[PDB]
Write a protein that binds this DNA or RNA. Sequence first.
RNA 1: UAAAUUU
RNA 2: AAUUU
Length: 534
Amino acid sequence: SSMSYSWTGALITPCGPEEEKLPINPLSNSLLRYHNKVYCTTSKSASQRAKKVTFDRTQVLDAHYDSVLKDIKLAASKVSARLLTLQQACQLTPPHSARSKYGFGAKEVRSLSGRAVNHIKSVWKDLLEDPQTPIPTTIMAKNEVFCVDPAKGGKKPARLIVYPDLGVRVCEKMALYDITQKLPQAVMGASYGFQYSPAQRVEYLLKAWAEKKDPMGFSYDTRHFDSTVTERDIRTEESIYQACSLPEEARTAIHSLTERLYVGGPMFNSKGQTCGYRRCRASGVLTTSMGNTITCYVKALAACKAAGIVAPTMLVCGDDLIVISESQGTEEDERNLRAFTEAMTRYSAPPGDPPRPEYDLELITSCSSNVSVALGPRGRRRYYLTRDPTTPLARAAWETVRHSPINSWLGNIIQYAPTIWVRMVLMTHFFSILMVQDTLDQNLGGVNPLDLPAIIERLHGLDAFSMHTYSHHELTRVASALRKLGAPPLRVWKSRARAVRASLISRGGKAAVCGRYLFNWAVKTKLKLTPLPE
RNA sequence: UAAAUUU
RNA sequence: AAUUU
Ligand SMILES: Nc1ncnc2c1ncn2[C@@H]1O[C@H](COP(=O)(O)OP(=O)(O)O)[C@@H](O)[C@H]1O
Ligand SMILES: [Cl-]
Ligand SMILES: [Mn+2]
Ligand SMILES: [Mn+2]
Ligand SMILES: [Mn+2]
């Protein structure tokens, strides 16, 4: 039936100028050598992304879908949700949010300026009065950094982002913010991934795995998910929203947003031209995550049922899914996954790479990450979350006139502190740099470098400073990512770490704590690291 | 562009 | 601010 997009042929223009790397990268030329491999997806590539996602969708539902959908609405009705005052919605707008066409931006919205509030007041009136006129959207190319991969095509084309004007974004929030906070967890219970921290995620997977007599695991992702979402899916999304108890004023707003925005509309490029028309998810609306998550969950739970997956325990985050079940033998397990995938394909969520049963927790990747294992200070197995370092390292070497990557280093150091690639590579580089520019006591992204051991202890446990004997997969992948980017191998970082450590300790104070906890892996004279007041 | 998590 | 989808 429905084509995901149609195109006037106008270009998908850039929303500003897209910075180029420079002939010297002074922050990262010590980190890695292959700067030619680090690139930023650009709007020039936007039309290739368009070709890849423009396609025809035929959806065939069935008893299993209908059944799961039914049960999900009974869940929805145990939910009470309120409108949000125009003001409360204004103040949830992020500080840099793209300004409105109508001559005001996010400063004004967040400070409740009167031109902003009056405009928004009328946009909301118009949603209540008019329940069908399509609402124009702006289409744009996302700039993200990656390492080139000649195996999978060289350079990825840019993701397409599609969004309404600021005034509309606020009204979305008035109608739906409260729902986004309550509904997903109500519908999906323990399966809703975003509710968990990373360490809860790991614990959840291990409990799931442990409780099977004979576990089997797999993951699924949908190829161009936003494109695979149909009008009917979006309307089914509405009817799930409507199954809650809601002010009538909300229902009309939901219904109107659904029909005027969510199921489709005209798209304008950044220079004002009509660009095309859209009959799938616009990634950029408030309901993107919740919508994706819920809809993925319906299809997936139905597909599980269509396929005989026994005692499934799910984790869903957007279009990213993990299922851990009772193996029915591998011959059956293969047949059932073939079936799972056929069902998802009938429901219009076809796979990027078709899935595969696995019987070892390390081999299951989802949300670009997986669980691994190492040994802790007393010899006990310590399970933790990790990922291929390729992208984080690439992003670590993105330096331009506008952008510095030091924040990226820190963010990864915190999130992935127990991994061998953060400990040996990023930490060493990060500290090495700040020491030399003598900027340790400074505050990056509202964090102080000198607080890290505390921060990491709070978050990952003290075992993060004493883990050893990392896995073959993980050693191989790290080694291999450093070779791919022209970074020193691990033995060299061992050396640089000793040096950094020594210099940090001689500095004394917090510095020295940093040096003793964060780099104990680097010495043979391993210390007895004790818990930290802070 | 939106959300979640971490901070 | 970081990361993810
Ligand atoms: N930067 C982003 N902004 C908004 N939505 C996003 C973003 N990245 C991913 N998503 C949403 O989640 C969906 C699944 O993401 P992913 O599997 O990572 O890519 P794909 O679109 O190729 O399936 C996307 O289609 C999109 O709707
Ligand atoms: Cl231990
Ligand atoms: Mn996907
Ligand atoms: Mn309706
Ligand atoms: Mn995905």
